Write a protein that binds this ligand. Structure first.
Ligand code: 9WW
Ligand code: 9WW
Ligand code: 9WW
Ligand code: 9WW
Ligand code: 9WW
Ligand code: 9WW
Ligand code: CL
Ligand code: CL
Ligand code: CL
Ligand code: CL
Ligand code: CL
Ligand code: CL
Ligand code: CL
Ligand code: CL
Ligand code: CL
Ligand code: CL
Ligand code: CL
Ligand code: CL
Ligand code: CL
Ligand code: CL
Ligand code: CL
Ligand code: CL
Ligand code: CL
Ligand code: CL
Ligand code: CL
Ligand code: CL
Ligand code: CL
Ligand code: CL
Ligand code: CL
Ligand code: CL
Ligand code: CL
Ligand code: CL
Ligand code: CL
Ligand code: CL
Ligand code: CL
Ligand code: CL
Ligand code: CL
Ligand code: CL
Ligand code: CL
Ligand code: CL
Ligand code: CL
Ligand code: CL
Ligand code: CL
Ligand code: CL
Ligand code: CL
Ligand code: CL
Ligand code: CL
Ligand code: CL
Lengths: 210, 210, 210, 210, 210, 210
């Protein structure tokens, strides 16, 4: 990634073995659960497009999702080229050429070009632009691999209300209010109806706390 | 987080894989026990609002508590906006706009704006303000998920007094003096009554030490 | 803690996840054995009062001992206030107010005040003063939770003298010379009596080495 | 590897025990799966030819592949010598001799010569040139040890389409579009034919999602 | 320990949790085998007397050996006082008082006094002097706890010569040439006698290699 | 080891607990396999003679090999003394005396003398000279402890050619071309004879790939 050292300059440093292993492990142990996205965004802090491709390449298996990720990146890169057509001409000394979509994706750009864009003044954050495309595609993976719809999350007759709300918002986070009351069991729903339409979650969970 | 480097300047650096995993692990292995709060406060030392949301997002499961956390943050952010109304006008060069509630929560603020507020002189500690809101909500989770009341923590007829005091103040810490004597078993309570009203805990535990 | 960076200035840095976990683990795996005290003193090297409270707060369970620790800290803080009464008056620019007992314990003092006292010239080491109070209370926990008295550590008829001395000074360290000879078995005691009153431990262990 | 320190100079530093163990472990636990290549490229970030040989030497077993790696490196080194014949003559002060093929492979070059080439201005990146040769040979190992051809990856009659696409692109990545439709089971292939020739992967996987 | 930072000054830094745990673990898993001594000497690199006492204090159990260690340190400290009597008088500004034996052992000396002696010019290496006393006592522990004498290490009739030499020099290292030939089995001893009196170990092991 | 800090000066720093444990572990888990040598050479990057002795001393067991290592070091040190006789005379200020063989081996040299030689200009790399002697002796250990000769590595009648070449070059690496064809099974040898005398390994392995 590109980090700031002891001085005020942004400097490239190698991706660490701890970061490489942390990303490989969270994919192996959690697949494409919703919480894998912010872990990816945090592990790729300040990452260049090269580091982003590195993290995606080190993932073995789930190649259907990774291939869908390539398709999403290609779509966003093509939209970037439509909005930012490169203007031909010799690049002035001490400057950087305009990045294409494949340059932001690290396909047709070298490392020192990515360093040049990210450490430029003003910077061209090709890492954050690429990560935005990757997270966009990864969110498409999560909603797609979400097994349960929110309409099917119903509280059991003897299920504690806390466990039901745990399953409700876990499913809701994957699929990406008043349904929480409707899908509660008869005994809890009677308590929630008499509680009021503007009750908070802690007020509702306290009322059905058995 | 925002840290001080070799020079005297406060500088942003990426959240470490060790910090990310340490927070995910303590939630998996201890849920919402009272000691999880100071671990969160320590793991988020110097954290920006972005790092605070990152730590909260990486938590899979317990979404009922995390949704209640969003409600608490929204309440505190709305109270911040009531106390600090943003005054319109162009921002002077080399300065920062006034943060809203959603800016402190990292919702409507970029990373370099959070860096700008936290490294300002005088600093606007949006990280400490947000962490104060998160810890406030997390404390509401702990007292809510506390299973046992302090009125039900009683010393067994053959339970050692040390183990009883261990259960007493562990329960008292979750729920957030003279009850300790009243809930002791008959044999120990006789010893404590004749000991005096101003006895310390080590004096009481020594007297009932069997 | 407060550490010295590349320059000669003492600078605050966040407590590390390794230090946080190392302290939580040694308490879980060794409770209040005597060797837990120097591990605490080493893990809290250069710690502020905030870091000291953090380490104590992250400990789940053993709340009877931790509550006794609060009582000891309150006693030492009250003695500090008796010896150092704060004199009222406006604090001069670039200076620090006099700390109270609760300020050294981190109760009524902010982090930058603790940084101000510890990095002052001359420094007010509120961290070392607080740690001295904590170690004092922790030593009261160790002697109190010591199960065996030194009078009951006797060498078995067939117990090797090395194992007996191992149990003797382990018990003696928890409770905090000529008794070692008296509590030896008859065969070893006969050897030690004829050895001389000023024999060293390696001379005594060699003589009873069987 | 050669890294940039606090100043702007590229400086050699020793290969870390974490990097050494991370490379040994991924070879032991994944052999020559496709994802081992980008892990090697990332673990050898900024590596000198000496570090590259070190990583290859620490691998025990798989010596057939490692011997094939030597043959590939010898071929690329001989092509480098054909394209870059060394011109004899005394080397000017403060300069570097032209590297041979065996110099880039770390065979006939010392460490400070590799430091001299890599930290030169303009630099002679003997590390990136050698790594390019190693990755080239390692890719020959992957395609060679690929057990299954893409023609034999067919969807089972009851196999979920997601699992079939997972096996398809995993095999395709090792061997290095319309075949995905042809190798689908009859029920899914009927759905894909009526879907259109320009359907994306997420559009195809959604249509056969059962 | 006392380490050199980015500048040329020797600066104190806290003992790390990794060093603390590494020393506790090697004592738990290897007790007082000979190889524990160089691990101690390496883990205490640049250690102050405070760090040396910390490492010794964190060791739970083996208190018979640790008590013998105190006796050895007291003997060496008393010999230091006999050779270096402290001369009374006011200490000049910016200087250090002469250390006693208990000052080198960290008993009657503060941390900043140990920093003052070790970072002095010329330095008074109280850490290396104390470590020399500790290693001296620890070597007395190893030879004392050595279970087997070198006279009893004999090669079995069917024991491979390599395994016999492994046991021979392992025992010899704990107790601290021609006996290796005499304690070999009859078949190997016949080969070694006809080999010559000045044969090397690899020449002897090759001759009895079966 | 001796490393370069933020400035351009070579500075000593303590051997890390990670390096100490990594060397102890690879010896415990791999003994004297060929791949242990480059792991030793990498873990001792920039090591002083003191660090080299430390790594060798921390190895428990295998004392027959370690004693043979002492004999090899003594031979190379005696050859160094024959080639470099020390010339008597007072050492000029700010200079270093000429090292003997035992000085390079760390036997009769202090740490600051090793620092003086290694950080000299021009440097006397006593660490690399000693490591060259240690690796030389360690290679004698590997060839000596190699159990199988290359003449006995033959392909089984049903053994896959890949597994046979894996055993061939693994044995060849320990003992330190046309024999690979001669030791193949009859069916594979018929294929290799008709393939040509100048076939590469990947060409031969592909031809016998069954
Ligand atoms: C190769 N490349 N090609 C693309 N688009 S394209 C014309 O349509 O094919 C594409 C795009 Cl958009 C983005 C980036 C890459 N990129 C990758 C990618 C990263 C990646 C992106 C992603 F979104 C998911 C993912 F896992 C990895 N690594 C691979 O793709 C590896 N891989 N290989 C095959 C093939 F064998 F079947 C795969 C099937 C799924 C994954 C496969 N590494 C690199 C390594 C070194 C130097 C450059 C690059 C590089 O530039 C791009
Ligand atoms: C999205 N956002 N929205 C809020 N308030 S609001 C209008 O009423 O909805 C809200 C508030 Cl107050 C604070 C902060 C966020 N924030 C989050 C939050 C953090 C968070 C706070 C918390 F207190 C608990 C927690 F776990 C996480 N992450 C999420 O909330 C993830 N998540 N998603 C759903 C949905 F799918 F059901 C959830 C249900 C429980 C948790 C859910 N990440 C971000 C990631 C990148 C850039 C910005 C942000 C961000 O700004 C805020
Ligand atoms: C709260 N506070 N109060 C005290 N003294 S007082 C009036 O008589 O109550 C007291 C004292 Cl003397 C010292 C320091 C604290 N301090 C603690 C303490 C540390 C601590 C000290 C100790 F010696 C043992 C220990 F484990 C933790 N954390 C707690 O005490 C947590 N805790 N809570 C309850 C209650 F719910 F039953 C407990 C029962 C045992 C432990 C409990 N964290 C803090 C976190 C953030 C900002 C400030 C603080 C703080 O200032 C002090
Ligand atoms: C020795 N050397 N020789 C080559 N080419 S050559 C004339 O035809 O033989 C060759 C080439 Cl091309 C590249 C580099 C090396 N190099 C190696 C290599 C690295 C390596 C490359 C590779 F592509 C695969 C791999 F695993 C390791 N280490 C070895 O090869 C170890 N090894 N030894 C035998 C023998 F005993 F059978 C082996 C059989 C397979 C691996 C073997 N380490 C070194 C260690 C210290 C100082 C220099 C060097 C060095 O310069 C080169
Ligand atoms: C206390 N002190 N006293 C000595 N000599 S003396 C008059 O004859 O008793 C003695 C000597 Cl010579 C050297 C150093 C110490 N020192 C220790 C020692 C270290 C130590 C040395 C050693 F060689 C072995 C070892 F394990 C630890 N820690 C202890 O000794 C802990 N301990 N306590 C008892 C008692 F309860 F039985 C023990 C029995 C065996 C170990 C015991 N920590 C300290 C912690 C904080 C501030 C100062 C100190 C300190 O200055 C010295
Ligand atoms: C002691 N010393 N002596 C040698 N040569 S000599 C006259 O003929 O005996 C010899 C040589 Cl050539 C090289 C270096 C050492 N050196 C060692 C050595 C390293 C070492 C070298 C090696 F090649 C293998 C190995 F494992 C360790 N550590 C030891 O040898 C430990 N050890 N002890 C006995 C005895 F008890 F049987 C052993 C039997 C096998 C290993 C033994 N540590 C030290 C620790 C602190 C300060 C100095 C030193 C030191 O200078 C040298
Ligand atoms: Cl790392
Ligand atoms: Cl995976
Ligand atoms: Cl794969
Ligand atoms: Cl831009
Ligand atoms: Cl409930
Ligand atoms: Cl569910
Ligand atoms: Cl609840
Ligand atoms: Cl990390
Ligand atoms: Cl969880
Ligand atoms: Cl979730
Ligand atoms: Cl403010
Ligand atoms: Cl009790
Ligand atoms: Cl309970
Ligand atoms: Cl008690
Ligand atoms: Cl850490
Ligand atoms: Cl605990
Ligand atoms: Cl608790
Ligand atoms: Cl003071
Ligand atoms: Cl004994
Ligand atoms: Cl006992
Ligand atoms: Cl003994
Ligand atoms: Cl490391
Ligand atoms: Cl392997
Ligand atoms: Cl091998
Ligand atoms: Cl070039
Ligand atoms: Cl499917
Ligand atoms: Cl398959
Ligand atoms: Cl699907
Ligand atoms: Cl650490
Ligand atoms: Cl132990
Ligand atoms: Cl103990
Ligand atoms: Cl001295
Ligand atoms: Cl043998
Ligand atoms: Cl034995
Ligand atoms: Cl042998
Ligand atoms: Cl370390
Ligand atoms: Cl071993
Ligand atoms: Cl040994
Ligand atoms: Cl030389
Ligand atoms: Cl094969
Ligand atoms: Cl074999
Ligand atoms: Cl093959």
């Amino acid at each position: 990634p590109i980090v700031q050292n002891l001085q005020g300059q942004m400097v490239h440093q190698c991706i660490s073995p701890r970061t490489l292993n942390a990303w490989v492990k969270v994919v192996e142990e959690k697949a494409f659960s919703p919480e894998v996205i912010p872990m990816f965004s945090a592990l790729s802090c300040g990452a260049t497009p090269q580091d982003l491709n590195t993290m995606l390449n080190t993932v073995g298996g789930h190649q259907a999702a990774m291939q869908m990720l390539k398709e999403t990146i290609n779509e966003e890169a093509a939209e970037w080229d439509r909005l930012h057509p490169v203007h031909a001409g010799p690049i002035a000394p001490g400057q950087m050429r305009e990045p294409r979509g494949s340059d932001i994706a690290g396909t047709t750009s070298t490392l020192q070009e990515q360093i040049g864009w990210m450490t430029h003044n003003p910077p061209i954050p090709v890492g954050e632009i690429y990560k935005r495309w990757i997270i966009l595609g990864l969110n498409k993976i999560v909603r797609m691999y979400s097994p349960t719809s929110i309409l099917d999350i119903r509280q059991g007759p003897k299920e504690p209300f806390r466990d039901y709300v745990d399953r409700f918002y876990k499913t809701l986070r994957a699929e990406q209010e008043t349904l929480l009351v409707q899908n509660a069991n008869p005994d809890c729903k009677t308590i929630l109806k008499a509680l009021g339409p503007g009750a908070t979650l802690e007020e509702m969970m306290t009322a059905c706390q058995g």
